[PDB]
Structures are given as C-alpha cells and as structure tokens.
Write an enzyme that holds these catalytic residues in place. Structure first.
Site, PDB file in Angstrom:
ATOM      1  N   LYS B  22       0.603  -1.289   0.070  1.00 14.38           N
ATOM      2  CA  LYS B  22      -0.014  -0.243  -0.031  1.00 14.38           C
ATOM      3  C   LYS B  22       0.875   1.336  -0.177  1.00 14.38           C
ATOM      4  O   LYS B  22       0.657   2.291  -0.995  1.00 14.38           O
ATOM      5  CB  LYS B  22      -0.892  -0.036   1.228  1.00 14.38           C
ATOM      6  CG  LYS B  22      -2.002   1.255   1.434  1.00 14.38           C
ATOM      7  CD  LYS B  22      -2.863   1.165   2.483  1.00 14.38           C
ATOM      8  CE  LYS B  22      -3.620   2.360   2.572  1.00 14.38           C
ATOM      9  NZ  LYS B  22      -2.590   3.687   2.845  1.00 14.38           N
ATOM     10  N   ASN B  23       1.707   1.331   1.093  1.00 12.71           N
ATOM     11  CA  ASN B  23       2.655   2.589   1.132  1.00 12.71           C
ATOM     12  C   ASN B  23       3.720   2.544   0.012  1.00 12.71           C
ATOM     13  O   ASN B  23       4.112   3.699  -0.314  1.00 12.71           O
ATOM     14  CB  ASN B  23       3.177   2.818   2.365  1.00 12.71           C
ATOM     15  CG  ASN B  23       2.161   2.983   3.625  1.00 12.71           C
ATOM     16  OD1 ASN B  23       1.663   4.036   3.753  1.00 12.71           O
ATOM     17  ND2 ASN B  23       1.763   1.767   4.207  1.00 12.71           N
ATOM     18  N   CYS B 115      -6.697  10.151   6.901  1.00 12.77           N
ATOM     19  CA  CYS B 115      -7.233   9.968   8.051  1.00 12.77           C
ATOM     20  C   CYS B 115      -6.295  11.247   8.932  1.00 12.77           C
ATOM     21  O   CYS B 115      -5.412  11.877   8.785  1.00 12.77           O
ATOM     22  CB  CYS B 115      -6.720   8.655   8.350  1.00 12.77           C
ATOM     23  SG  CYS B 115      -7.545   7.507   7.468  1.00 12.77           S
ATOM     24  N   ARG B 120      -0.603  17.158   9.957  1.00 15.58           N
ATOM     25  CA  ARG B 120      -0.042  17.166   8.430  1.00 15.58           C
ATOM     26  C   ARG B 120       1.195  17.928   8.432  1.00 15.58           C
ATOM     27  O   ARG B 120       1.414  19.092   8.213  1.00 15.58           O
ATOM     28  CB  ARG B 120      -1.213  18.122   7.691  1.00 15.58           C
ATOM     29  CG  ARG B 120      -2.677  17.214   7.673  1.00 15.58           C
ATOM     30  CD  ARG B 120      -2.369  15.797   7.126  1.00 15.58           C
ATOM     31  NE  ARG B 120      -3.846  15.228   7.099  1.00 15.58           N
ATOM     32  CZ  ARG B 120      -4.420  14.793   8.289  1.00 15.58           C
ATOM     33  NH1 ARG B 120      -3.382  14.669   9.364  1.00 15.58           N
ATOM     34  NH2 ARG B 120      -5.642  13.970   8.029  1.00 15.58           N
ATOM     35  N   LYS B 160      14.591  17.325  10.057  1.00 16.11           N
ATOM     36  CA  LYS B 160      13.920  16.045  10.887  1.00 16.11           C
ATOM     37  C   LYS B 160      13.616  14.891   9.751  1.00 16.11           C
ATOM     38  O   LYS B 160      13.515  15.373   8.585  1.00 16.11           O
ATOM     39  CB  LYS B 160      12.692  16.714  11.535  1.00 16.11           C
ATOM     40  CG  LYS B 160      11.433  17.193  10.580  1.00 16.11           C
ATOM     41  CD  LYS B 160      10.163  17.579  11.620  1.00 16.11           C
ATOM     42  CE  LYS B 160       9.696  16.290  12.185  1.00 16.11           C
ATOM     43  NZ  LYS B 160       8.510  16.801  12.792  1.00 16.11           N
ATOM     44  N   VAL B 163       7.899  11.207   6.534  1.00 16.11           N
ATOM     45  CA  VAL B 163       7.470  10.144   5.728  1.00 16.11           C
ATOM     46  C   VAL B 163       7.443  10.382   4.232  1.00 16.11           C
ATOM     47  O   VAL B 163       8.002   9.921   3.380  1.00 16.11           O
ATOM     48  CB  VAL B 163       6.073   9.883   6.324  1.00 16.11           C
ATOM     49  CG1 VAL B 163       5.733   8.491   5.485  1.00 16.11           C
ATOM     50  CG2 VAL B 163       6.117   9.411   8.031  1.00 16.11           C
ATOM     51  N   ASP B 305       5.826   1.940  12.285  1.00 16.76           N
ATOM     52  CA  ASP B 305       4.496   1.428  11.658  1.00 16.76           C
ATOM     53  C   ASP B 305       3.921   0.026  12.263  1.00 16.76           C
ATOM     54  O   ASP B 305       3.002  -0.332  11.928  1.00 16.76           O
ATOM     55  CB  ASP B 305       5.016   1.088  10.176  1.00 16.76           C
ATOM     56  CG  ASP B 305       5.322   2.262   9.289  1.00 16.76           C
ATOM     57  OD1 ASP B 305       5.071   3.344   9.609  1.00 16.76           O
ATOM     58  OD2 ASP B 305       6.229   2.085   8.279  1.00 16.76           O
ATOM     59  N   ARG B 397      -9.748   0.205   2.706  1.00 14.72           N
ATOM     60  CA  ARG B 397      -8.413   1.248   2.061  1.00 14.72           C
ATOM     61  C   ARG B 397      -7.112   0.523   1.960  1.00 14.72           C
ATOM     62  O   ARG B 397      -6.313   1.047   1.323  1.00 14.72           O
ATOM     63  CB  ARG B 397      -8.421   2.654   2.752  1.00 14.72           C
ATOM     64  CG  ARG B 397      -9.690   3.255   2.872  1.00 14.72           C
ATOM     65  CD  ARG B 397      -9.520   4.647   3.874  1.00 14.72           C
ATOM     66  NE  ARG B 397      -8.611   5.412   3.104  1.00 14.72           N
ATOM     67  CZ  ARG B 397      -7.535   5.707   3.684  1.00 14.72           C
ATOM     68  NH1 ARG B 397      -6.957   4.959   4.488  1.00 14.72           N
ATOM     69  NH2 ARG B 397      -6.712   6.560   2.852  1.00 14.72           N
TER      70      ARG B 397
END
Lengths: 419, 419
Positions: B22-23, B115, B120, B160, B163, B305, B397
């Site tokens: 998925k990712n 989600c 963000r 930093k 993702v 994760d 999803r």
C-alpha cells in the site's frame, strides 16, 4: 405517533415518560466539519495576497437528543437528560498574527484567520475518592446547620390548623342559631370585651367580626410558599472537584509552512455528581390538566377580602363551603413529596473547560514575537445517569415522615365540613 | 453506515495469502508521469485508495485500463487542474506535485486530508522545491509551480526525518540536472522497495537504506517491468491475532528482510519463529506473551509503523510495558476504544503506559483511523461479547476482502448494509 421526543401514551390519551429512552438513548454518527474553509490575509514574503485555503477533515461527533418536555411531577425539577458530547478531537480556532522584521528579505506580516488542529483528548479519568467525603459532611452537619430552619415549618403548619378549627365553628352557628357562641369569639381578637354592633343579621357580624382573622391566615399562606419551595431547592447536591492537565502540541507549519508554532494548552477537567430525592410512586403518571400553577394559591388568600362584592347575598351557602374544597386539593398534591422518600435520581456530569494558555513561535531557530488569541469552539461535555449509591445510612425518610401525619389531619377536617 | 459483527470466541488456525503493498505502490503510480514509455505493474490489490488514484489520472487525460495487471500509459495528459473531492480523500496525493513541474510546466495541487494522524507535517514538502528551482506561489489553495527548464542540483540539508519528505525529493530529482544528495533521509522499507523501480527504468540511485543517498541526475528514461513486493504490515498484523488466541499460523509470500527487528523481540518472549524466503512460521505453544520496552524509531530497530498492531498484544500480556511514540503523537484514538471493553491505561506526554490484563468483553467501538481499525476487529475474535465497529470504510482502504480471509481461519464475520 403524533409525539415529539420523550412522550408515550398511557391512559385516555395521557402522555407519560419513557424510561428506556431518557436513560439509554441511541447515539448516531455525524460526519460534518465546522469550518472546512478559511482565509489567510496579510503580506507574506513581501507579497500581499488573500485566497481561500481549506484545512483538514474527519470530524466524528456523537451527540444525543436534548429533551426538555414535561418534568416528572408537579412543581418539581427537570428529569435527567442524557447529554453526551464526544467529539473526534480537540479543535480550537486560533486567529494568530505572526510577523517578523529581520534584515530585508525576511520581512512579513500575515494574519492567520480560523486555524484549527486535531490532537488527543484523554477522557479516561475518574475521581471516586474526592466526592465521597463531601457527601458525608453534608449529611452529618444537616441536623446542625438546618436544625432551626426545618423546625419553623413544623410549628407553622400546626398553627394554621388551629385557626381552621375555630373557623368551622362559626359556620355551624348560622344553621343552629346560637348567638352566645359567636359574639364571644370576636371579642377574643381585641384587647378588652366590647361589641362593635348589635343587629339581627347573622351575616353582618360574620364579615366584620372576622376581619383580624383574615389578616393572620393570609400571612400563613404566603409564608408556607417560601417554607416549602426552598426545601426542594436544597435537594440538588451537585458538587465536585477536578485537577489540571496540560496538552502539548508541535509540528504546526501553516500558510507558507516556514515558521514553527507551539505552546502548552492548560485544560480544566471537572467531574461532579448530583443527587436528588423524590417520591418513588409519583413519577409514574403526569397530567397537565390538574397542574395548578403557583398563582392559584395567592388567589384563595384574597377571596374573603373584598371591599365591594355581591357574594354575600347571591346564595352564600355555595361560596364559603367551596373555599375549603380548593384548599384540600393543594394539600393532597403537596403530600406526595414526603410519602416514602426513596433515592431514584442521581446524575454525573464531566466536562472540560479552558483556562490560560502560553503559546510560542519560532522560524528555523529564531525568536519570533507572537501576539495571538486562542478561542474555544469544540470542547467536552458528558452527562449520564446512575442507579446506585455507596453510603446510604442516614436518610431523609424518617425526618419527613412526621410531616405526613400533619397534612393528613388537615385534609380530613375539610371533608367533614357539610352544608 | 456499514458495520461488522464478529462473534466467538473461536480459533484461528490455517494459512493466509499476503496481498500487495500500500505505502510502496503509491510512489510507483506517480513516477509514471515522467516516463514516456508504458510500464508494467503487477501485484496490486483492489483497495479504496487504489481505485481512487485510477479515477484521478483518468480525468487528467491519461487513458488507463486494468484487468489482470496494471498497465498505465501516462503520456497524453492535458488537464492540469485536479479535483477537490479526490485530493482531500487521501493523504499521499500531495506527492504528485513533483512530476507536475519536471516534465510538463504547471500544476494545481490542493491540500490533502486523509485520516486524522497529526497536524499534516507538510513543512518539508515546500522547502524541498525552492532549493531545486521552483516558484513559491498559490491561488485559492492551488499550489502553482512554473519554471523554465529542469530542476537544478544542490545539496539539501534536512532537519527532521518525515515520511513524505523523502518520497517528494526522490520523485522530483530523477530527470533533474545535477547531483542532489539527501541528508538524513528515511530508511523505512517503503523507500527501498520504491528505489528498485527507478533502477529498472534507468535511474542511477545506489545506496538504499541510508540517511545519505547520492542521487545522480540523468536526462530521460523509459519503461520497465517490476513486480510490487507484498506488504510487510499485513504479515505482522496476522501474527498478533494468533498470539492472543494460542495457535499457529503459516504465512505465504512475505519479506523477512523487511521485518528484521520486528521478529527479534518476539523470539526472547518464548515463541518459535521460523525464518525463510517465502514463508514465515510462528507459534506460542499456549504460553503467555511478555512486554517489551522499545522506543519508536525509523527502520530498523522497531519501525514506527507497528504502533496499533502491537498495542493489543501488550495489554493481554503481563508486567508493565511502555512504547515511546515520537512520530504519531496525535493518533491516540485506539486507547479510548479499548478502555470501554474493560482495560486501563494512561498516556503520559508522548508515551502510552500499557498494563497487563487477561481478556476483555466485546462492545460498541468506533474506528476512525487506518492502523487503529485492524486492532478492533481482531479483538472480537477472542473476547466474550458482541463487537460492533463503526465506520468500517477504512479497513477496505488497505485490506481487500478481510472478512473472507478470516472466514477460512475460523471467524464468524458478516457485512451489514447501512447507507
């Protein structure tokens, strides 16, 4: 079924109160954001602009229907309405206005309009060791603090019954015709022993002879309203105590996403529990036709006081006897508030308020002046209902049991008054 | 709203086929905008986020089609404006801004949502384009970007580890002229699997799994064939449901190299773990799991994760275990959902305190996140009570036909229609 929310049929088209809905409601799922769009005014990077930038989404708030229909009894309090407010997160609008003046290139003065964020809300906290000692001191000192206010109400209702006994003897003298047991009662109110007038009319000495008596009974009716409504207001022990908890939040980079915003919001967690006392066999039925407001009590006190009336000649037998019928109906409804007092209520409120806040603001490791003003839109509120009680040694059932025998002795006296 | 209703408790014994990723499959679909040759993508499950990206590229002007294998030929894109109902749905849609300025010349990308996992962190997505050669401008939320020629090459000094920061710079520096060195990159397995797709095309990127990667700039590339590796989270998720039920599960088509430190801590607890190349075995022998105290950090050494996957395992164990979360410090929704079943926990600062209880009771829960939705369904297979999960549209999803894979293993799960 031609009913709004919280109503249920009963007898002959009589509305009641459903217990499976007010105590156990059915929550729904709502997916609607409060402010999905906002603007970013001001000048950024030496370029003034004003657009319409949206924000994030995903706001699941479960609410319960708020009902404020009929209560539970006549002249009582509102029922325990389950008001549950569990938002998805903690969103607060921030109308910030960050600006920095360093050198010539790093010079901006943008105004942030409607800025919200989504963090965490630790709603898992209890205080079962702070609200229990508060109920012991209130019940132990109830006989010492209010030991004199309750005693005044007992001697007041008993003194009113003595005046009604002497008034009943005056009506019996008209049918019998004894003049010796009528003129001696009038002289008892004055200082000496004299007669204002002497005629043959039996209704002439009954109105003017009872003038000081009407002024004393009226003061008792007005005082009983204050000595009865204040007792029901003392049955709302909704006290509580909470602590403090700060919430940390970082990684805030709005607009151009070059300056860092952070702070420390200090919330105010509160947790209180309320307890009420009512009749266990009074909230079963409720009719709005027999509900007499407080204005009907003040009208009966001024019935005999009239500077000009024709009721003394238009069948006087159907006027003085009917006055006692309205008094017994009021005492019959107020007597249910002291017969078999059982703990049937009990709610628990847990909400979170907002106090002071210390927010900061940097930009790539540089002290930047911050002059914002945090508001409060989405908060936290909870209101459930319980049916248990830990300590229940000393109750108000034995104390209010003596007031029932006094009210029953007066209701039986008005029924024996015949025509 | 559609909801599930899993009963039990039953047993979970058998095998299960791991689907696609998925990712790792999202950056592959965005890398086809720069290549002028039709590529071949295999091992792509039917998910909600996968079907959403198909309709997004269709409105731009690229005719896509699939039946047994993904064959996207994006080379005739003419529409640059992206809709709003498709960007706010997911979160990784902002990564498309890279290829929409490298080969074309303009692009309008709105602010995504997805989600609720934080605030963000899009601060590194904007800073990663100015150092390469872009224009900072926007209008009505549409992030405009227009620059003549290819992007320049310069050394990027990051602050930093995020993702989407590594994917944004990597997907916007392939065809760009100049050598760009990414400092302090993300060593997560999603970057290693994505870098293998660029080598087949013709990119000269060597040094995967390192904070310092030297990306060589080329001119133009072509097409290539590469099979997407299976997801690593789906394999480790099924191992948690088997450890809490005391059984044995044999996985098929997995990647043991992507979960090095994940299976290292479970071996010392007293569980037989068999390694390999295409199958991973695990058995508890009826023993009780333990608790670990490993701080979250980018891969390796327990990646971030695996937060909601190992949350239920630490609660059903013994002792006192704590996990310091430093990436998703705002996704604390799986804790209040498990406290209603009959568990106690506490979140201090950024570390959740997990205790050690036995079993729980099934109740009405709500799943509003992605990783927190799988922990609520697997808990109903061993608890005593009816488990009702609200908003189940997040499970589809990332997982295709989850109710069918658990049916053969031993779990009564059915889908109930809603809207």
């Amino acid at each position: 079924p031609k009913l709004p929310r919280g109503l249920r049929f009963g007898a002959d088209n009589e509305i009641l109160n459903d217990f499976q809905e007010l105590w156990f409601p059915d929550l729904f799922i709502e997916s609607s954001d409060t402010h999905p769009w906002y603007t970013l005014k001001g000048r950024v990077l030496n370029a003034h602009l004003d657009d319409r930038l949206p924000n994030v989404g995903g706001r699941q708030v479960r609410r319960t229907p708020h009902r404020v229909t009929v209560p539970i009894a006549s002249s009582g309090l509102r029922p325990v309405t389950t008001v549950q407010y569990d938002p998805a997160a903690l969103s607060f609008l921030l109308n910030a206005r960050v600006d920095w003046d360093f050198g010539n290139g790093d010079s901006a003065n943008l105004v942030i309009n409607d800025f919200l964020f989504r963090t965490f809300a630790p709603k898992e906290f209890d205080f079962s060791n702070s609200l229990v000692p508060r109920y012991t001191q209130a019940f132990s000192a109830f006989n010492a603090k209010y030991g004199t206010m309750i005693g005044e109400g007992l001697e007041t209702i008993k003194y009113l019954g003595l005046l009604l006994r002497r008034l009943r003897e005056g009506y019996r003298a008209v049918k019998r015709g004894d003049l010796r047991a009528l003129r001696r009662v009038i002289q008892s109110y004055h200082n000496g022993k004299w007669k204002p007038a002497t005629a043959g009319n039996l209704w002439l000495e009954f109105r003017y002879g009872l003038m000081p008596l009407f002024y004393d009974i009226r003061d008792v009716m007005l005082d009983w309203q204050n000595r009865h409504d204040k007792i029901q207001r003392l049955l709302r022990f909704s006290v509580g105590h909470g602590e403090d908890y700060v919430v940390e939040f970082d990684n805030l980079y709005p607009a151009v996403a070059y300056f860092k915003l952070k702070g420390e919001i200090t919330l105010e967690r509160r947790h209180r529990h309320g307890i009420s006392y009512a009749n266990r066999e009074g909230y079963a039925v409720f009719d709005n036709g027999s509900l007499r407001p407080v204005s009907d009590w003040k009208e009966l006190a001024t019935a005999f006081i009239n500077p000009h009336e024709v009721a003394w000649e238009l069948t006087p037998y159907s006027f003085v006897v009917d006055w006692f019928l309205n008094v017994g109906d009021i005492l019959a409804q107020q007597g249910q508030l002291y017969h078999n007092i059982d703990i049937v209520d009990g709610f628990d409120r847990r909400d979170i308020r907002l106090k002071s806040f210390t927010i900061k603001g940097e930009r790539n490791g540089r002290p930047v002046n911050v002059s914002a003003s945090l508001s409060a839109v989405d908060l936290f509120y909870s209101r459930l209902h319980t049916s248990n009680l830990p300590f229940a040694t000393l109750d108000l059932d034995t104390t209010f049991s003596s007031f029932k025998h006094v009210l029953d002795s007066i209701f039986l006296l008005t029924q024996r008054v015949k025509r | 709203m559609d909801k599930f209703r899993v009963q039990g408790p039953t047993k979970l014994q058998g095998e299960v086929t791991i689907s696609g990723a998925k990712n790792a499959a999202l950056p592959i679909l965005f890398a086809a905008l720069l290549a002028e040759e039709p590529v071949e993508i295999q091992n792509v499950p039917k998910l909600k986020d996968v079907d959403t990206s198909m309709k997004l590229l269709s409105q731009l002007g690229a005719k896509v089609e699939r039946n047994g294998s993904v064959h996207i030929d994006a080379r005739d894109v003419n529409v640059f404006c992206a809709p709003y109902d498709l960007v706010k749905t997911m979160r990784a849609s902002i990564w498309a801004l890279g290829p929409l300025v490298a080969r074309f010349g303009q692009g309008q990308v709105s602010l995504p949502g997805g989600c609720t996992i934080g605030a963000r962190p899009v601060d590194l997505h904007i800073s990663g384009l100015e150092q390469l050669g872009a224009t900072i401008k926007l209008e009505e939320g549409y992030v405009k970007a227009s620059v003549d020629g290819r992007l320049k090459g310069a050394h990027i000094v990051m602050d930093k580890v995020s993702v989407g920061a590594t994917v944004t710079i990597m997907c916007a520096a392939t065809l760009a002229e100049g050598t760009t060195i990414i400092e302090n990159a993300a060593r997560e397995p999603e970057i290693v699997d994505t870098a293998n797709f660029l080598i087949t095309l013709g990119a000269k990127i060597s040094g995967q799994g390192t904070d310092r990667i030297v990306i060589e700039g080329v001119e133009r590339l072509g097409g290539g064939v590469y099979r997407v590796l299976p997801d690593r989270i789906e394999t480790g998720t099924f191992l948690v449901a088997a450890a809490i039920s005391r059984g044995k599960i044999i996985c098929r088509n997995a990647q043991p190299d992507t979960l090095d430190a994940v299976l290292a801590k479970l071996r010392d607890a007293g569980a037989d773990i068999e390694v390999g190349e295409d199958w991973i075995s695990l058995d508890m022998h009826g023993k009780r799991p333990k608790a670990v105290n490993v701080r979250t950090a980018p891969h390796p050494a327990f990646p971030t994760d695996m937060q909601a996957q190992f949350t239920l395992l630490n609660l059903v164990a013994e002792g006192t275990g704590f996990i310091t979360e430093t990436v998703f410090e705002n996704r604390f929704m799986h804790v209040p959902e498990l406290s209603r079943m009959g568990a106690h926990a506490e979140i201090e600062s950024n570390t959740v305190i997990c205790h050690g209880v036995e079993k729980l009771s099934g109740a009405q829960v709500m799943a509003t996140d992605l990783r927190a939705s799988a922990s609520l369904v697997l808990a109903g297979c061993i608890a005593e009570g009816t488990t009702v999960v609200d908003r189940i549209y997040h499970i589809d999803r990332g997982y295709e036909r989850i109710e069918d894979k658990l049916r053969a293993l031993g779990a009564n799960i059915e889908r109930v229609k809603g809207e």
